[PDB]
From a paper:
Site 3 overlaps with the CO2-binding site, displacing the ZnOH−. Thus, the binding of any imidazole molecule in this region would suggest enzyme inhibition, as the ZnOH− is essential for catalysis. Similarly, molecules of I, 1MI, 2MI and 4MI bound to the active-site Zn2+ could well be responsible for inhibition.
The reaction follows a ping-pong mechanism, in which the rate-limiting step is the transfer of a proton from the zinc-bound solvent (OH−/H2O) in/out of the active site via His64, which is widely believed to be the proton-shuttling residue. The decreased catalytic activity (∼20-fold lower with respect to the wild type) of a variant of CA II in which His64 is replaced with Ala ([name] CA II) can be enhanced by exogenous proton donors/acceptors, usually derivatives of imidazoles and pyridines, to almost the wild-type level. X-ray crystal structures of [name] CA II in complex with four imidazole derivatives (imidazole, 1-­methylimidazole, 2-­methylimidazole and 4-methylimidazole) have been determined and reveal multiple binding sites. Two of these imidazole binding sites have been identified that mimic the positions of the ‘in’ and ‘out’ rotamers of His64 in wild-type CA II, while another directly inhibits catalysis by displacing the zinc-bound solvent.
Residue numbers in the entry: 4 to 125, 127 to 261
Amino acid sequence: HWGYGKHNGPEHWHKDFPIAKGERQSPVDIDTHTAKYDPSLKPLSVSYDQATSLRILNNGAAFNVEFDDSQDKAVLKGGPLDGTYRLIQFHFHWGSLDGQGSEHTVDKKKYAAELHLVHWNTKYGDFGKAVQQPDGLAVLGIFLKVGSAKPGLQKVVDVLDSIKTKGKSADFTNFDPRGLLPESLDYWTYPGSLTTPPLLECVTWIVLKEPISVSSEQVLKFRKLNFNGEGEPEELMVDNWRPAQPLKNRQIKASFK
Ligand SMILES: [Zn+2]
C-alpha cells in the first residue's frame, strides 16, 4: 500500500494510480515571476465564525482535524470560486527537518510544512461526489516557516500525544481555525489534484502568499507522530509530502500585484 517510503513513496504511486502522471497534478512549483496578476480575481471570502470541529484522526498519512460539514457553517467562497465550498477537514504536510516539508514550493523554495484546509462544492451534495468533479474541491494552502510560535496551533500540537499511531482518534471540539490564518489573504490559484492517492483532479488550489510562523517546538511535536499502527514497528511520520509535479498546460494566477 502507498506511503512515503523508498518502496511505496510518491515515485511508485502511478502503478496503482495512473492519474499520478496526469495533466493537472499537484503540488507544483509556483514560479512567482511567471504567475500572472489577474485583476478579475475577487478577494477570498473565508467564513469560519461558525466552524464546528469534531475530531482529530491519525490516518497513517497525516492527522486530520475534521469538521461538521452537514450545514453551511464554515465556508470558502469568492476568490476564483463559483459557489460555496464547505470545510470538511484540515491537515498538514511536513519535513524531517525545517528545510523541507511543504508540497508547493515558491521559486523552488521549500517551507517547513504546509497546511491544507479542504472544502467541497456544496452543489455536489457530499465530499464523495465532489471528488468526482473537476470543480469539486477548493483547498486553501498555507505555508509554515519556523520562527515565533503560532498561538492558535498549540491546541492541535498538544493533543498529538493521544493519536500517535495510525487509526487513533480523539475528540477535538471548539477548535477555531481562524487562528491558523496569516494576516493577508493574497493568493496564487491554479487547477490541480489531491496530493495523495487517489490523486483525483478535482481541486481548485488557492495557496496564500503569506506564510504563518510556527515554533521549532511546535513542528517537533508533528514529527513525533507515527505512520504505523499501534504495536507495530515505529516509523516516524516525517516527510509526508509529495514533491512538485509538472505544470504542463496550466497557468498560475496571482490575486495581487
Ligand atoms: Zn494535503
